[PDB]
Every structure is written in C-alpha cells, then in structure tokens.
Amino acid sequence: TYIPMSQRRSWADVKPIMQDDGPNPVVPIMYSEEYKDAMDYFRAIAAKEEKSERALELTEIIVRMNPAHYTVWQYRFSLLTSLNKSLEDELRLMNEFAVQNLKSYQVWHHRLLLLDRISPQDPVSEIEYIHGSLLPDPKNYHTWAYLHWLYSHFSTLGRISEAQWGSELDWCNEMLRVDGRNNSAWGWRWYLRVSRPGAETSSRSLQDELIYILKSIHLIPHNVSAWNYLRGFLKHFSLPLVPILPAILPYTAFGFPMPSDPLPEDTPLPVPLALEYLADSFIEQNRVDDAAKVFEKLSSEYDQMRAGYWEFRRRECA
Amino acid sequence: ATEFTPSVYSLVSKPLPSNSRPSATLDEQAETEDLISQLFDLTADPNALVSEHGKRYSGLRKQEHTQFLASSFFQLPGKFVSLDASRPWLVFWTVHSLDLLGVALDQGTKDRVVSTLLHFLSPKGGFGGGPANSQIPHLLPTYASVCSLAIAGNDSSTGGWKDLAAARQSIYEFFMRCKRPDGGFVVCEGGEVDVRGTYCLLVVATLLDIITPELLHNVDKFVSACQTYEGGFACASFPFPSEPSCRVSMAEAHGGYTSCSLNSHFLLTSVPLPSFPLSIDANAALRWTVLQQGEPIEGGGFRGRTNKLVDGCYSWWVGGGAPVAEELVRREKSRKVIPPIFNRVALQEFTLVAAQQDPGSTGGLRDKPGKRPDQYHTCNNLSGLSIAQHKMSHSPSTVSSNRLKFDASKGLPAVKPVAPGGGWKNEDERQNARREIWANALGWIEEEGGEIIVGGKDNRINTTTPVFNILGLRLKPFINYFYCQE
Numbered sequence: 001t002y003i004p005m006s007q008r009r010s011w012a013d014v015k016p017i018m019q020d021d022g023p024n025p026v027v028p029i030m031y032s033e034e035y036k037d038a039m040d041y042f043r044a045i046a047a048k049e050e051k052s053e054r055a056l057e058l059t060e061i062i063v064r065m066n067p068a069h070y071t072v073w074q075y076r077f078s079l080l081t082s083l084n085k086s087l088e089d090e091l092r093l094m095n096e097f098a099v100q101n102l103k104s105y106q107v108w109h110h111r112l113l114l115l116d117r118i119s120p121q122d123p124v125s126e127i128e129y130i131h132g133s134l135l136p137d138p139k140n141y142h143t144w145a146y147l148h149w150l151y152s153h154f155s156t157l158g159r160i161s162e163a164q165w166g167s168e169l170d171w172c173n174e175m176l177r178v179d180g181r182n183n184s185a186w187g188w189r190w191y192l193r194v195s196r197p198g199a200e201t202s203s204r205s206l207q208d209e210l211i212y213i214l215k216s217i218h219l220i221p222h223n224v225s226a227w228n229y230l231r232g233f234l235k236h237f238s239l240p241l242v243p244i245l246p247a248i249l250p251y252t253a254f255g256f257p258m259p260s261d262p263l264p265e266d267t268p269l270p271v272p273l274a275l276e277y278l279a280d281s282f283i284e285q286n287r288v289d290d291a292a293k294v295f296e297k298l299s300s301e302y303d304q305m306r307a308g309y310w311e312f313r314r315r316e317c318a
Numbered sequence: 319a320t321e322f323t324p325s326v327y328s329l330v331s332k333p334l335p336s337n338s339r340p341s342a343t344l345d346e347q348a349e350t351e352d353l354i355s356q357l358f359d360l361t362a363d364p365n366a367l368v369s370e371h372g373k374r375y376s377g378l379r380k381q382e383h384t385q386f387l388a389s390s391f392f393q394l395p396g397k398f399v400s401l402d403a404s405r406p407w408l409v410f411w412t413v414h415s416l417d418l419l420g421v422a423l424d425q426g427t428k429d430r431v432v433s434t435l436l437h438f439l440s441p442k443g444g445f446g447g448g449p450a451n452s453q454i455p456h457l458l459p460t461y462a463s464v465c466s467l468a469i470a471g472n473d474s475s476t477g478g479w480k481d482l483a484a485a486r487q488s489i490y491e492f493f494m495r496c497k498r499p500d501g502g503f504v505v506c507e508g509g510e511v512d513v514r515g516t517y518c519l520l521v522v523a524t525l526l527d528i529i530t531p532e533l534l535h536n537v538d539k540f541v542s543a544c545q546t547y548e549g550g551f552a553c554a555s556f557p558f559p560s561e562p563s564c565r566v567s568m569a570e571a572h573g574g575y576t577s578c579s580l581n582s583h584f585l586l587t588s589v590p591l592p593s594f595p596l597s598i599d600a601n602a603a604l605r606w607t608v609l610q611q612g613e614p615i616e617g618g619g620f621r622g623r624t625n626k627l628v629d630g631c632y633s634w635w636v637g638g639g640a641p642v643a644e645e646l647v648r649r650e651k652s653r654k655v656i657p658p659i660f661n662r663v664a665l666q667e668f669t670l671v672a673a674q675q676d677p678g679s680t681g682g683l684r685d686k687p688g689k690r691p692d693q694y695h696t697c698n699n700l701s702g703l704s705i706a707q708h709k710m711s712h713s714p715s716t717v718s719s720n721r722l723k724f725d726a727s728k729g730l731p732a733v734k735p736v737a738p739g740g741g742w743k744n745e746d747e748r749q750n751a752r753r754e755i756w757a758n759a760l761g762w763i764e765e766e767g768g769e770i771i772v773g774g775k776d777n778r779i780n781t782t783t784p785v786f787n788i789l790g791l792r793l794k795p796f797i798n799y800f801y802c803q804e
C-alpha cells in the first residue's frame with residue numbers, strides 16, 4: 001500500500017503546493033496518486049530552494065516516473081553540485097536508467113553534464129560504455145551525437161591519444177562490417193577520417209579512403225550510404241569524377257577497386273545513383289546534352305519517384 | 319500538373335535489392351515494405367472515378383480524426399505522464415490539426431486554451447511545459463505556446479495577445495540568457511544545445527518583434543556548420559577554439575534537424591546585417607530532401623535519414639522543408655546570373671492509404687501501419703499533406719508589395735538590449751530591419767492553379783505556411799498585432 005508523503009515523519013515540516021493550472025485547464029493528464037504527491041512536494045522544495053538529501057531522493061522518484069521532466073532534472077543536477085555528491089555514483093545510476101529503459105533528451109544531457117564536470121583525465125571508460133550501449137539500437141541518434149561530443153570535448157582538452165583515435169576507427173570499421181547500411185557509422189567514419197580537426201590529409205590517406213569507399217560500393221551496390229559518402233568525399237576534396245568512372249560504369253548498364261566480374265546476385269541494373277554519377281561526370285566534361293539524356297532517363301524510367309527533380313536537373317543542362 | 323508526379327499505383331513496386339548481402343537494416347526494410355505494400359493492395363486506388371468493390375476506401379476520415387483529437391479538451395489517460403513536460407505541444411498539435419481539418423472551436427473553448435497557456439508563462443520570461451509554479455521556461459514550449467495563442471487567441475482583453483505583448487522584454491531576456499557565444503542556444507537553464515532551440519527561438523523572435531543584433535550574433539554560423547556531407551543537417555555543431563577556429567557537425571543529417579536548420583536559415587535571410595547570414599549549400603540540401611522520399615513499395619512516404627524507415631511525420635519535416643530549399647536554390651540561381659520537386663501525388667497517397675488509422679476505430683494518423691496513432695503524428699501527417707496539396711512558394715512580388723505597405727511609424731516599444739552596444743545602430747536601421755522581417759514573414763503564397771487534391775476535393779485540407787506551420791489566416795493578424803500593422 002502506498003504511504004502518502006503527508007504521513008511520513010521525514011516530510012512533516014513541508015507544506016505541499018498544488019499545481020497551478022487554473023480552474024479548468026485544457027490537455028489535463030490524469031496523474032497517479034504517487035506522481036501528484038511527489039510533484040506537490042517538489043513544488044514546495046523548489047519554492048523554498050532546499051538543497052538536501054531528501055530533495056535529491058525526491059527528484060529520483062520523479063524522474064523514474066517521468067524521465068522527460070526537464071525541470072526536475074535541472075534541479076537534480078544543481079543538487080548534485082551544491083551537495084558535492086559523488087558524480088561517479090550518479091553515473092552508475094544513469095547506467096541503470098538505460099538498463100531499465102528510462103531514456104530521453106534529458107537523461108542523455110544529464111550524462112553529458114556529469115562527464116563535463118567530472119572531467120576525467122582519460123574518458124576511455126565512458127567511450128567503451130557508449131560502444132556497448134549501441135547493442136539494442138545501433139542507430140540511436142542521441143548516442144551517436146553524444147559520442148561525437150565526447151571525442152570533440154575531450155580532444156579540445158588534449159586528452160584523446162593517437163592510440164585512442166586508432167582503436168575508434170577499428171571499432172567503426174567493425175560496425176560497418178556487421179551492417180554496411182548503418183548510416184550512423186558512416187557519419188562517424190566521416191568525423192574520424194575527414195572532419196575532425198586532427199585528421200590527416202595526404203595523398204596516402206586520400207588513396208586509402210577512396211579504396212575503402214569503392215570496396216564498400218562493390219560489396220553493396222545499392223547502398224545509398226556508400227554512394228552519398230563517395231559524393232561527399234569527392235566534392236569535399238575537389239576531386240574529379242571522371243578518373244573514377246571505370247569503377248562506376250558497370251552499374252550504369254586501373255589501380256582502384258573494380259566490381260566483381262560477374263556482379264553479386266540480386267543486383268538489378270542500372271543503379272540510379274550510378275546514373276547520377278555518370279550525369280555529373282558528363283557535366284564535368286561540359287557534355288551537357290549527354291548529361292541531359294541521363295537525367296531524362298532517370299526521370300522517365302529508372303528513378304520515377306523523383307521524376308520532377310530529375311526533370312529539373314535535365315532542364316538546367318540547357 | 320501530374321506529369322512528373324506518378325501515382326504509386328501506376329509504378330512497378332519492387333523491394334530494395336539485397337546484393338546477396340543481408341543485414342539488420344535490410345531485415346527491417348523488407349518487413350516494412352511488406353506491411354505498407356499489403357495495405358496498398360487492400361485499398362482502392364484513390365485516383366479512380368468509382369471506388370473498387372471489396373477494397374478499402376481511402377478518403378480522408380476527417381470526422382474520425384476530429385473525434386480522436388477531442389480528448390484534449392476533456393482529459394488524457396495516465397500514461398500521458400511522459401508528456402507532462404510537453405503540454406503546450408499537446409495544445410499545438412490539437413489546435414493546428416483542427417485548423418487544418420477546418421473545424422472551429424467555440425469561444426469558450428478558445429478562452430480555456432488561452433487561459434491554460436498563460437498559466438505556463440513565467441514572469442521572468444518564456445513558457446514552460448506546464449504551469450509556471452511547476453516548470454521552468456523552455457524554448458520549445460515557448461514556440462508551441464506562442465503558435466497556439468496565434469491559433470486560439472485574439473486582440474481583446476481576454477485574448478492573450480495583450481499578455482504576450484507585455485511579456486516581450488522578459489521573453490527577450492530569457493532568449494539572451496539562453497544564448498551561447500558560438501551562436502547556439504540552450505533550450506532551458508542547464509539544457510541541451512541544438513537547432514530545435516534555434517528554430518523555436520527565431521520563429522518567436524520574428525513574430526513578436528524582438529530581434530536584435532546581439533541576439534543573432536554567430537547564430538548563422540552555428541546553423542550553417544550543422545550541414546553534413548550528405549546535404550541535410552545534424553542536430554548541432556561543435557566549436558573548436560583557436561572566435562572558434564572551426565565548427566564540425568555532430569551527427570548525421572536528419573529530417574527534423576534539416577527542417578529546423580533550413581527554416582532557421584530562411585528566417586535569418588530576412589535580417590539586414592552585413593555579410594549575414596553565412597551561406598549554406600542549398601543545392602545539396604535540396605538533393606538530400608528529395609532522396610528521402612520512399613519508393614512505391616513503401617507508399618511514397620518520407621524517411622528521416624538514409625537507410626532508415628519511412629514515417630508519416632516526416633511528411634512535414636522533410637516535405638515541408640522542400641519549398642524552403644527550393645527557394646534558396648532559386649535565389650542562388652538568380653544570384654549567379656517548374657515541375658514539382660518531390661512526388662506530391664505519392665505523398666498524399668501515403669497519407670490517405672497508410673498513415674490514417676484503420677476505419678471504424680479511434681481515428682488519428684500514425685507513423686506507419688502497425689503503430690498506434692497519436693497527436694504528434696496526426697499534426698505532422700496533416701501538415702505535410704497540406705504542403706503536398708497546395709503548391710507553396712515565397713513570392714518576391716508579394717514581399718515587394720508588403721514593403722510598400724509597411725508603416726514603420728507604428729510598433730511596440732523597442733526591446734532594451736542586454737549589452738550597451740547590442741541593439742540596432744539607429745532608428746533608420748531598426749525600422750529597415752522591422753520592415754524586411756515582417757515583409758518576408760508574410761511572403762509565402764499558394765500558387766494559383768497549383769492545387770493537387772488526390773482522391774477528390776473532399777480530401778482538401780487548409781493551407782499551412784512553410785517555416786511557421788500555422789495557417790496564413792492565423793499568421794497575418796498575429797504578426798500584424800505585434801508590429802501594429804493594419
């Protein structure tokens with residue numbers, strides 16, 4: 001049986017404060033007794049600006065019932081810092097919230113604030129936790145954004161070693177080996193190899209990256225993630241499309257990877273993004289009529305869901 | 319008008335090929351293709367003159383959807399507690415959907431909406447997700463409350479707009495407390511930083527005439543650095559210090575953050591500051607937008623990111639971003655000196671056939687088959703359906719006519735900036751800013767003759783506005799109130 005807080009000796013000094021909705025609010029929610037009672041006492045705690053262990057316990061009760069309650073999370077973090085609580089213990093509590101499927105923008109942001117304030121000399125333990133947490137959802141957007149933030153923040157402090165960057169690419173390569181269609185892991189590869197400020201740009205690194213992209217396309221020719229990464233790569237580094245055309249032309253029906261002599265089964269031709277590559281390489285050669293003819297086929301035969309877009313591109317050729 | 323918008327029923331439906339390379343992504347894609355294509359198979363083609371016997375009729379079940387939303391004005395069950403910090407969104411999703419569906423609220427119910435929202439307004443500035451004695455202000459409930467007051471309020475003494483006007487300085491001060499030096503904003507005290515906050519803040523600042531130079535500094539750079547190599551936008555960018563030496567996008571391109579980024583950047587192009595806003599790659603954003611429309615076997619709905627599943631709410635996020643991307647491309651084509659840009663027919667077919675709750679049930683619209691309908695997917699499906707039905711464009715001649723009628727001698731008191739040099743330089747510059755921002759905010763039109771109503775005129779819903787996502791007949795008197803025009 002539930003015991004109301006008005007009947008708890010530890011709370012006898014506190015006068016609860018009711019929610020001030022007005023007399024007949026729209027979108028009212030039928031709250032459980034436990035949740036209303038806890039919020040009635042939270043309003044009083046926050047009114048008197050009490051920073052205490054009982055206030056800390058109360059915030060945990062509330063965010064277990066509603067993990068998206070940003071006001072109570074904000075109050076909880078100020079309780080932790082005011083009381084100089086163990087932030088490593090709090091991080092262990094957040095590990096449980098993930099386990100019991102308590103999640104939101106607010107919980108993820110709480111974890112970031114903890115890491116920021118702990119400011120570990122080496123964040124390797126948190127990196128490994130984040131990697132393991134991707135097991136039930138390898139495309140969790142919050143998790144990938146948090147991983148980006150963690151490496152960016154701690155690299156700004158000089159705390160990501162060359163060995164650490166190297167094993168992060170190793171982990172990224174394995175993620176794409178298990179599912180080459182994971183566009184989140186492709187985005188992470190872009191950070192690791194291209195956009196992060198410490199990335200190497202040399203003729204070797206450009207050659208290596210192009211080899212990995214082309215091998216990935218030859219493994220899964222219909223994988224949009226690989227085509228988009230190829231197009232972004234070439235564009236970002238101002239590299240011509242034409243010299244690579246030998247590897248792309250077999251999909252539109254020399255040193256760098258070529259398609260399998262017989263193509264993999266279940267690979268119907270043409271691949272529409274291969275045709276887009278061909279049209280753009282025609283434009284690079286100033287062969288606008290040839291480009292227009294390819295756009296026209298994309299519009300009327302091969303990618304008809306985008307008939308209007310491909311017609312727009314066709315008309316731009318004139 | 320449908321030459322380049324083929325119906326899903328007229329195209330060959332075929333699965334995403336496997337290349338003999340199975341993966342978890344492909345397992346889910348194939349299962350979703352089966353769900354959606356089977357429902358299309360049981361449903362009569364909306365484009366037929368007489369509906370087929372034995373098959374489901376796809377007409378928009380407007381009265382079912384109205385009844386679904388009606389719970390908002392009585393009570394929500396106890397499992398709504400997860401949205402207890404989002405109650406202004408429950409209001410907005412309800413009252414904007416009713417506007418789209420053409421259903422009027424009586425004055426007593428509108429007055430309850432206004433009164434409820436004003437209890438969420440805190441005296442120090444901004445709306446929270448619930449009562450001000452319970453929740454701190456937040457940028458996202460502030461947008462939802464402001465737009466809801468545009469839909470349900472009025473200019474009288476009980477209409478709420480008068481209270482908003484009196485709160486302009488405190489809301490501005492809340493916005494400046496949220497501001498980061500790099501151009502991001504926290505969504506609330508101690509809250510996260512992303513382009514949802516930027517979008518919500520810029521909409522409200524535009525509508526209430528509280529934009530200043532100090533408010534906008536670096537905001538364009540934060541947003542522009544969110545663009546990824548795919549052409550869409552991520553949630554945020556990270557500033558690396560020597561202001562920052564460079565900024566890097568923090569996650570993958572996503573339909574919701576791409577909408578927020580395109581809309582934010584579009585609102586900034588109205589602001590007459592020198593070399594502002596920093597440009598984006600509009601062509602790449604348009605390309606990314608159109609590539610997210612699904613194949614015929616998935617009903618022509620939009621996905622929110624590459625290699626994930628279609629979902630009706632991206633009809634608004636991605637589809638509603640298309641006219642903005644199109645306008646930015648047009649401006650750049652003009653600067654360097656006609657068919658629809660996505661399949662407007664197929665998106666409507668997805669909405670009617672796949673996103674409606676099955677008939678004779680709760681009503682409402684949903685993510686996809688197999689998912690319960692909710693208020694958020696009801697609003698976003700209908701907002702995206704509106705964009706597909708009505709051809710929206712930003713009209714330079716309309717903006718020009720707006721400039722010609724603006725009265726700069728009318729307006730509310732100028733906001734007092736936080737820092738001494740943070741305001742406009744003089745009245746000539748401030749009034750020029752007010753004129754440009756007002757005149758462009760009112761520049762969206764529906765093109766005469768561009769209407770496409772799949773399934774017949776009984777499926778027509780009202781026209782929403784790109785960027786703001788409220789009806790033009792709400793936007794115009796609301797923004798005119800705060801700028802003291804007509």
Ligand SMILES: CCC[C@H]1CN(c2cccc(OC(F)(F)F)c2)C(=O)CN1Cc1cncn1Cc1ccc(Br)cc1
Nearest residue numbers: 407458514515517518573574575578622629631635694
């Ligand atoms: C209760 C609705 C939850 C929904 C929408 N939502 C949101 C709420 C208020 C405002 C807002 O944005 C803005 F700018 F303030 F209006 C966005 C979320 O946070 C998460 N969502 C989950 C979801 C459903 N189907 C796709 N998603 C992913 C997704 C992620 C980010 C974005 Br953006 C859009 C969709």
Ligand SMILES: O=S(=O)(O)C[C@H](O)CNC1CCCCC1
Nearest residue numbers: 378379380381382383384677678
């Ligand atoms: O699908 S909707 O248009 O939203 C509403 C439902 O059709 C209700 N149908 C009624 C059945 C009995 C006769 C009166 C109409």
Ligand SMILES: O=S(=O)(O)C[C@H](O)CNC1CCCCC1
Nearest residue numbers: 046440441442450451452453454
């Ligand atoms: O005077 S104002 O600052 O504008 C309004 C109050 O201070 C804010 N109310 C608090 C919100 C969070 C829970 C406890 C009450």
Ligand SMILES: O=S(=O)(O)C[C@H](O)CNC1CCCCC1
Nearest residue numbers: 375377771773774775776777778
């Ligand atoms: O205006 S038109 O597009 O020519 C045709 C009408 O809208 C047809 N709507 C149906 C009528 C019968 C009941 C179900 C809806």
Ligand SMILES: [Zn+2]
Nearest residue numbers: 629630631685
């Ligand atoms: Zn959705």
